Symmetry: D2
Subunit: 440 residues, 4 copies
């Protein structure tokens, strides 16, 4: 791999620097206080494994803007395709005047998603819009209303995706009333419930059948790895068992692969590790090299249930974002990012080999470049305090680490798949020393 900016960490004695401090004051004056960014620097370049700020700091990027910049934040093929497309046209609204890159991205998605059955796609802008439209096609197809979601789920910040999201603070509180006919089932969380995949599936199926009923249920929606919920990997056989139940009970099984999709996990989709074939898949984030695109891909007969003009949105499938995605997907093949994702896991597990020694480390989990540590206290309760402290410390040392978890006690690793081995190991070494410092 060749890089445009230096791939080495460096932070000044005073962070933020003066230009970033100035931009932070403008942000306080102009921007809703809810938008409280974590990085103590204003980005001017994102390339390989580095975020470069307005003051010359270079932060190691283990965030990829939350699993979005899988191909890098400024991949040359993506930037070239974006520039070229904008010079031809930025927008026509596909429903009004169509264009080839929309159709080409639908074909790409139909080809890359699990299963050999006939599939169709529809393109939107945000992950929340993709989840909303996945619910729309399932309701239109089944003629049934209810939506089943899981403990620890996250599906977005719209009224319905807030209902589907498990965590009240800060995603839901004060924004209700929320969309009705949404029902929640227990998740396979093996660290906490010690259940096998099939046992966890029996428990979930028992709730859904007792409390909801197949005859009322359009869809069951699950993240094959739960993201904001804490990189929760279900026990083997769990997802398969839920998919089988949905097929037997004429319920649409929807995999939300917005975070887990496009090689993040070392497979094209996380569904592939257990060879689960979802009826419908939502994608976003890594799809378009950072440009705003999302998609719903599914069985042709499900995707065709809505009538003419029944799905839409002005910007959906923006031609510049579609050109970006076509360029990014080809990069993923050409640069063998699937093998890089697999190598990223090996390196993380290697650098975390000493973490067993720490009574605060409950579990190391995930797949490919979607890995996490869960942190606990002396009595085994979630350790959100320590999680926050370790992330703030890493940050002061020039490493951007994200937290998540139902209980706020999970450090996640989301490096871009183009990060240099040298840069990744430096990043993971800073994390382990910050964990040493905060527990010692």
């Amino acid at each position: 791999l060749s890089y445009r900016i230096p791939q080495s960490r460096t932070v000044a004695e005073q962070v933020p620097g003066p230009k970033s401090k100035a931009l932070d004051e403008r942000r306080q004056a102009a921007v809703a206080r809810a938008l409280a960014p974590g990085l103590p620097g204003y980005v001017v370049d994102a390339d390989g494994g580095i975020l470069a700020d307005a003051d010359g700091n270079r932060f190691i990027d283990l965030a990829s803007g939350i699993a979005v910049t899988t191909v890098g934040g400024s991949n040359a093929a993506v930037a070239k395709a974006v520039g070229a497309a904008a010079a031809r046209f930025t927008h026509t609204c596909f429903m009004v005047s169509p264009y080839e890159t929309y159709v080409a991205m639908a074909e790409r998605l139909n080809a890359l998603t699990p299963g050999d059955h006939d599939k169709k796609s529809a393109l939107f802008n945000s992950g929340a819009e993709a989840v909303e439209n996945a619910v729309k096609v399932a309701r239109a197809y089944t003629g049934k209303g209810a939506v089943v979601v899981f403990d620890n789920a996250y599906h977005g910040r719209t009224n319905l995706t807030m209902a589907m999201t498990a965590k009240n603070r800060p995603y839901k509180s004060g924004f209700g009333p929320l969309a009705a006919d949404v029902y929640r089932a227990p998740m396979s969380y093996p660290l906490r419930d010690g259940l096998s995949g099939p046992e966890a599936a029996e428990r979930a199926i028992s709730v859904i059948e007792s409390q909801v009923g197949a005859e009322n249920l359009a869809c069951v929606v699950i993240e094959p790895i739960q993201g904001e919920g804490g990189f929760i990997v279900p026990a083997p056989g769990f997802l398969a068992a839920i998919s089988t139940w949905c097929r037997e009970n004429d319920v649409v099984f929807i995999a939300d692969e917005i975070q887990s999709g496009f090689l993040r996990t070392g497979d094209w989709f996380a569904s592939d590790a257990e060879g689960v074939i979802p009826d419908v898949i939502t994608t976003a984030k890594g799809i378009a090299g950072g440009m705003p695109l999302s998609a719903v891909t599914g069985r042709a007969e499900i995707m065709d249930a809505p009538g003419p003009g029944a799905l839409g949105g002005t910007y959906g499938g923006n031609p510049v974002a579609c050109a970006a995605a076509l360029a990014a997907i080809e990069v993923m093949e050409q640069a063998d990012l699937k093998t890089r994702a697999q190598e990223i896991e090996t390196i993380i597990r290697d650098e975390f080999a000493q973490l067993s020694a720490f009574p605060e480390v409950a579990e190391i989990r995930g797949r490919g470049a979607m890995m996490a540590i869960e942190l606990i206290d002396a009595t085994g309760r979630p350790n959100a305090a320590l999680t926050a402290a370790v992330a703030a410390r890493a940050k002061a040392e020039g490493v951007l680490l994200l937290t998540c978890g139902t209980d706020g006690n999970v450090i996640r690793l989301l490096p871009p798949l183009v990060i240099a081995e040298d840069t990744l190991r430096d990043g993971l070494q800073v994390l382990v020393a910050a964990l040493e410092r905060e527990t010692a």
Copy 2:
């Protein structure tokens, strides 16, 4: 020459051509059937007043991708900003890692929107997300639940924005159950109701007070000109009276300026035309020269009600889109597109001089580059059939014009503000001869 592509209409004997025909069969196999595009040609350039298709046809663009490409479909300042931003970084997620263009776009919105009170902004991707977030800050600020919307309203295709949208077909049907605590009031539709502004407002307030109650009501949401509902302009005084009632009753007044904003009506915001000062204003479409961007701008105290992390979305305020928006807004100022919008209204009214001679034309309405004609039968009832036939005849002659209206009987005009006078006149002459041909 002022334009990249020729600014003259040309359609072949057979449209679609074989390239567009081959693309339509690819669309049929790969894309959900709900997305049935209107233009019989696949777009390769959008520049000035023209859409060029893959077969060499040139259509006059009186759509601007539904009031999005105000500054033209491939504006050179927009294309430059987009290419340059993508080469530095496509995305960081503002909530994680901040950047200047997000802050500058909030500053620009705060400055350009009505009122000299303290304002803050939050950026998202689609118009529906912007409306969803306007409701969220109104609910967070008031501690009240209910939402009031109007007859003929359109607000988007999410679960809450469908509830907020008036027309069932095709936007809402089969997608329920929809978010509750949404109440609908009668609209000032002077052609149909014959009411003064103050009278229509008294009627709307009487329904709100009787059925909803201020003590239950977070917000009143209205388009200052109703777009999809038929370019409905409320009677003079209506918006002020509703604005006054909200202030007197602790209810947030929200102007949906997604279609009517950014000089579309010959003012910066349609609200300006009666110096109404909304508490909160939603923007999208024309804001970013075709890139996916939307915004909520309001009174600082309303925008800051949500807590840290309580508003968000991965892509919102994309740096490539914010770069495009800063460029488009500079073009609006520097090319004085405000005057171009006023001249466009003059030209539209001038070419429609002889529409007096048509009993089928009920009304010519709107302002600037947001103009419409409502078509009726011999009884004075809506004539959707004539509306569709005129649109299809115009398309066959190489002019793209859109239709809308609760009853499907409104031809709307949404030229880009950079359209050449000769191109606009040719487009309008084709529309007038299509109406002549189709009414005999």
Copy 3:
């Protein structure tokens, strides 16, 4: 007719009397403050046309406990049935252990309700429970979700019946969120809209088709005379046209006859006056001579759509209340209360011959023993102050008169059908003298 207590009005200069004042002190200590009884006397007897209080006052009853004690408040046949049933059994729960009086009352309702098609009934306690169960059998039967109700409607105080009710204060305010998928259509209110029945029906059907869609709609629910809304009588042909549209569009037409049913209007059901044949009819109030009973009666195939145990309620079709209802219906037949209700309408219109002295009287409307006066001010606006003054003056003079109306400007007349002519004329002469005095 034979009476148990004296049938002449006699009310003290000072009311409440001492025994009623002491009871009111106990009420204030023990009963939720929302229950604020109007009559300045504690009832010890209700017989014929009279409410006798603890202090010996005899008030003329033009309320019949809100259209409930149609056969009188202590009919000797009803009283004897109630005594006799309770000494056999008070209760078994019909769906556990059945009993003949439940079945006999289902047969009575099947027979007395409009239409010659096969009908079945289910019995509950309150009118709200009967409206809830009418919606349940329509949803079960159609497999569709939405519910259509009208301006000025009143259907009860449960979560769903509050949503169905139009007026926020005091019935709905503060008790949300309320059941979703409830849509409101405009009412035929001839005094205000000037529309023919067919014109009002076209207007309502336009809203329902535009905003709801038959494909989403289980049922249309309307009171054939709107009770709490102000004894609104739709223009001739309105109910027929709505019933026709429901038949043509596979939507269940539900008549709410809770107030209007059981000879209140001089027909068995107010639907009879225009030969309308509802799919489903809700009854309560006058059905059981004051005992708590309600009923859903409908097409056998609609009533049978719910499966075994899918409808219920512990008390529903209480054997004591059914014994009361069979006795009350036998009185209605034996005492020819149908003719009495027509004579009561004639006596009311006779005693109101001079309301032409009053520009405050906008309309006299209703049928049988369901008659009303709407009051306006000198500018033609609703006159709730005069309405409340007249009712307060009447009570003080010893006449119980209820008020109602969306705008609180309607005096209603709901005398029991067993009222003596001399008692009714005294009552009406008091009302007319109260109107002369409050306007004079």
Copy 4:
């Protein structure tokens, strides 16, 4: 005690007898299919522990009309009170014309319910109406929206109370969409979860804090013993801890004592067995000796939050039902039915000595005259088939047994507290012989 009808079991070889068969044919013609009664006889008398049918059969009553006829089916003091009251007046509507027996029942409830704090009451007809009004006062008082309920909960058959009810079949299926802002927490079901009281409460509270948030929550509603769900008695300490959490979090703790109240469990309120003092308590069933009455009793400040007219219902607090209830409550005191309940428990545990052995019997549980057996197969899975067969076998031998359970595998015992000991022992011996016969 003194019985009006012979207290010995007698059934013919063939049931139903012929009068009951003629009545069942009339029911099938006239009554909605959902209301398929279980007893193979039409009831003519209910007295002591006997249901006498139209054909001379005498069934032992282990049902009491689902926990309603606590004082017997035709108690002489209740029957006399009902006859005397009906002969004076059946109904006035308390909120129109008040009467002493409504006030006297509010005083009785204020005095009998847990705690010494100031209380007020409101009277309705059904248990579901009481739960609906408990939610209404909790929302009015808190100004918060959400309702927490538990797994296995049963609260009624209205839109909101169905939402609050856990089990889909047959109570909820096909009747949505249901009222929103209802959240479910896991229940203390020690047999199934092997959890302690304290653990179970922490588990429930973790869900409520994480998914709902106190700042959004009006009320927590729980049955102190879960009736339809399977007579689930929570582990000791569970209810206390939920009550403690609600007081610390400004959330209203509503105890649903509709089935468990008025001495059924051998305390006045099942809450008493743990010194829990509910903020609000809902009662019905046993309150009025089989007459239709329900009540909401709570803290005066909570009960007074709704404004004048904001709670209501035509029939609520019917004077005949209040007379019945005042007579029933005097019988409970004067005949020491509290001791009769404690004695019935001893008799049930005695006759069950040669049961709890049977491997198919998982648990005997409950208190007083609220006792149940849960049945399993060889695997330990729920045994609904055996449950149905035992109950069918018992009925044919002249004993009325109800079943219940989330999984349909619970035989419940609800004798009237006036049953003779020899009648109860005969009934329980039939149950054991039926279980012996049906376990092949």
